[PDB]
Design a protein around this ligand. Sequence first.
Ligand SMILES: [K+]
Ligand SMILES: [K+]
Ligand SMILES: [K+]
Ligand SMILES: [K+]
Ligand SMILES: [Mg+2]
Ligand SMILES: [Mg+2]
Ligand SMILES: [Mg+2]
Ligand SMILES: [Mg+2]
Ligand SMILES: [Mg+2]
Ligand SMILES: [Mg+2]
Ligand SMILES: [Mg+2]
Ligand SMILES: [Mg+2]
Ligand SMILES: [Mg+2]
Ligand SMILES: [Mg+2]
Ligand SMILES: [Mg+2]
Ligand SMILES: [Mg+2]
Ligand SMILES: [Mg+2]
Ligand SMILES: [Mg+2]
Ligand SMILES: [Mg+2]
Ligand SMILES: [Mg+2]
Ligand SMILES: [Mg+2]
Ligand SMILES: [Mg+2]
Ligand SMILES: [Mg+2]
Ligand SMILES: [Mg+2]
Ligand SMILES: [Mg+2]
Ligand SMILES: [Mg+2]
Lengths: 116, 158, 44, 110, 103, 71
Amino acid sequence: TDTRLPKRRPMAHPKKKRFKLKPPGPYAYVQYTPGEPIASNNPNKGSVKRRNAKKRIGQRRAFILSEKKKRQGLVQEAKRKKRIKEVERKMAKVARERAWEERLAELQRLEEEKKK
Amino acid sequence: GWKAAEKLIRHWKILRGDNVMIIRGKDKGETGTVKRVIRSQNRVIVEGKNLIKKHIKGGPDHEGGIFTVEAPLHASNVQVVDPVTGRPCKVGVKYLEDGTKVRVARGTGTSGSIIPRPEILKIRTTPRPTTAGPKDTPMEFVWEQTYDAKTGKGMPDL
Amino acid sequence: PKRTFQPSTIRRKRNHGFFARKATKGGRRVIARRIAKGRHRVTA
Amino acid sequence: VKIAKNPLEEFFEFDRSKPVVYGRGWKASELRLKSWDDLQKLWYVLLKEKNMLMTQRQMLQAQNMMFPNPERIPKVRRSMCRIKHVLTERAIEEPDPRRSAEMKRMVNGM
Amino acid sequence: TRFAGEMARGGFEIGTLAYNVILDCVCKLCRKKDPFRLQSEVEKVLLEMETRGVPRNTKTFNVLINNLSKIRRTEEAMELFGRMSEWGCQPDAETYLVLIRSL
Amino acid sequence: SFRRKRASSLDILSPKRAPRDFYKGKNCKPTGFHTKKGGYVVQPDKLPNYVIPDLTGFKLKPYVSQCPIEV
RNA sequence: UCAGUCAAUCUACGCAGAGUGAAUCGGUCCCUAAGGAAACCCCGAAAGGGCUGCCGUCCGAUGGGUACACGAAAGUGACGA
RNA sequence: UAUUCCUCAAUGACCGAUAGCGUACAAGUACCGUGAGGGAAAGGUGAAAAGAACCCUAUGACGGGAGUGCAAUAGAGAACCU
RNA sequence: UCCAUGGAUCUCCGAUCGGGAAACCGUAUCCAAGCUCCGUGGCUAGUCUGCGCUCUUUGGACUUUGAAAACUUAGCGAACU
Ligand SMILES: [K+]
Ligand SMILES: [K+]
Ligand SMILES: [K+]
Ligand SMILES: [K+]
Ligand SMILES: [Mg+2]
Ligand SMILES: [Mg+2]
Ligand SMILES: [Mg+2]
Ligand SMILES: [Mg+2]
Ligand SMILES: [Mg+2]
Ligand SMILES: [Mg+2]
Ligand SMILES: [Mg+2]
Ligand SMILES: [Mg+2]
Ligand SMILES: [Mg+2]
Ligand SMILES: [Mg+2]
Ligand SMILES: [Mg+2]
Ligand SMILES: [Mg+2]
Ligand SMILES: [Mg+2]
Ligand SMILES: [Mg+2]
Ligand SMILES: [Mg+2]
Ligand SMILES: [Mg+2]
Ligand SMILES: [Mg+2]
Ligand SMILES: [Mg+2]
Ligand SMILES: [Mg+2]
Ligand SMILES: [Mg+2]
Ligand SMILES: [Mg+2]
Ligand SMILES: [Mg+2]
């Protein structure tokens, strides 16, 4: 029961360009304010400019931010692994000292058994 | 080195199942039955004759050893035995009363008797299966006629 | 150093392509001579 | 298993067990006994079988395994060709021009 | 559909004549706009009939047979005609005439 | 199946081996029309409809039985 | 086995199998530049060469565009260092 | 009367693998050049694959035996007659 | 299997419906007739008639000739030597 109409296909016949739609003759009939200088160009609220250029600017800004985030993530992950290695090194120090206590006890007491 | 410009034999007077005598080669003077005809080489295999020895290396599937099998003989090296005299003979073409080609013995010293077509030829090498498979339609379903042009039974959805 | 061949696909098709040859009488003679010799590559 | 539980399992041979045997292709004289509805149903049965067979060949050759009974594919292919020939025969013998054109369009449409 | 909903929420139950009219309207709209949608829409209207406990009569089968025959689906109309006794309905002259013209 | 071709057929232009604005296509049937904003409107009248019957309860199978029948 | 400046177990190397998922990315599509070509017309032993307009067509991005179709004496799109 | 993009049949004190067509072999290919264009090389185990099971030594048999075959330096994988 | 004859199917470029980086893209041509089905409108309402499309048949409207070695007949016409 939908009453909406389908989008229609564009026609392929040639259309007149706007220069040929103007009447021939020397005069141009431009918009004129009776106390103001005649403007060379009268843009309105639809006169939008540089749409592709702004799209490219936004794309470049997004690329810069994304590459920065990638770089920061890689740096942070490597510093995390470095901190883990520092903690493991500090643990291995005291494990090494205790193991040397055990080994020195074993060697000096083997010599003590040689003494008895 | 198959160096000869040998043409194919197009209509064979030498058939599978024929009783022949080897008339040329190492096994000259020996009789046998034609096990197989190799048409692409103009050669035949006579059962138990022209034996070779193959050194087959056993893989995971077959078995190794030195095996004795028949080697092919050229089709001009064998000759159909005359059914009366028992001697090798040439083969002629005789048309019967109905008009069917038959082979007859030909040559001086032959009986001219009909050389019969071997009975082994009518037997299928790949026999028909005993049990139909799960995707095989039974023949009673195949024969069910659901179309009739005269009464318009089975027309499409026009 | 910089060498003579600097590849560009669209320039190759615009100079030596099939329809580039078909556009001139000399190019059509090139195609006919080319087929008469039996080359597999009629146009570049 | 016996029956495919979902549409994905219709791309697999659920009946494959004892060497399984497969019959021959349909003959044109046997297809000339069948109605248009039966012939269309048989066309789609053959189409699903052909899809399953090519799926099995593609799966096995992706793992460097041999595809067993490769003659099953041309049997189905030739049966489908004979079905379309029989239907085109029926289209040609139709005396009405509009019905003949519609039957030809139904057969050859893609 | 909105008026049927309003009358069901007002107190009146909806009957077989109204379901026959909705089924006919659905079938005609399907045949005008998209005829390959006809079978699920018919299935939905019929399932609304057996959910509400409203039984089918001869007019329901007449509507279905007439609408199937106008897109030349004669085999479905014949299969539906053969099963009219299972819903307890019996064919009348309109069913026979529509099926003879379609055959 | 592997099949022999001419080596010269590798010189035919393909969009996989082309500049990014070269379009060829694969003989797919159109489903609508291009718009002049770079879009595409699919028209359902150009879409395929597949009439496929229900296959449950059907007795005919892909192959015909080869069992010995009668003389 | 070849290749790799090797006696290589490795590999951009040989065999085999696999892998690239888009309404929005890039294209296609619409629009035109430089330029190219038809038509009409002009010129020329032939082949061809010119002309793109006073009413005029089709291509051609390195640029302008992103949720119908048709029309226009409305604005514009629209720009340097 | 002229000619051969072609067909059929036949002939040669014509050539016989650096010869004869550029090509006896998947050649106007490979390869070279932006392009027009230029343009190769490469025939033969044995009658028949019977193409050497098995053993020994090497990482690995193409080796040494064994066996096949008239013959095995007749043992090759676009190549083994002399 | 194979043969003879007759059939069914029969992608694309070259190429001719338009565009084009050959093998791709876009394409229900247009208009008269007479016929089943289809849908909607209108009468005093029964073998009642009047408007349409889609596709089918027969025509007629636009336009598509078209390749090919040598021989032939013509136009123009060297230089080395
Ligand atoms: K002999
Ligand atoms: K040469
Ligand atoms: K020798
Ligand atoms: K001179
Ligand atoms: Mg020989
Ligand atoms: Mg080149
Ligand atoms: Mg087809
Ligand atoms: Mg091919
Ligand atoms: Mg690519
Ligand atoms: Mg296409
Ligand atoms: Mg190396
Ligand atoms: Mg690799
Ligand atoms: Mg985009
Ligand atoms: Mg311009
Ligand atoms: Mg110009
Ligand atoms: Mg001109
Ligand atoms: Mg053009
Ligand atoms: Mg344009
Ligand atoms: Mg661009
Ligand atoms: Mg600008
Ligand atoms: Mg040589
Ligand atoms: Mg020599
Ligand atoms: Mg030579
Ligand atoms: Mg060896
Ligand atoms: Mg010799
Ligand atoms: Mg075209």
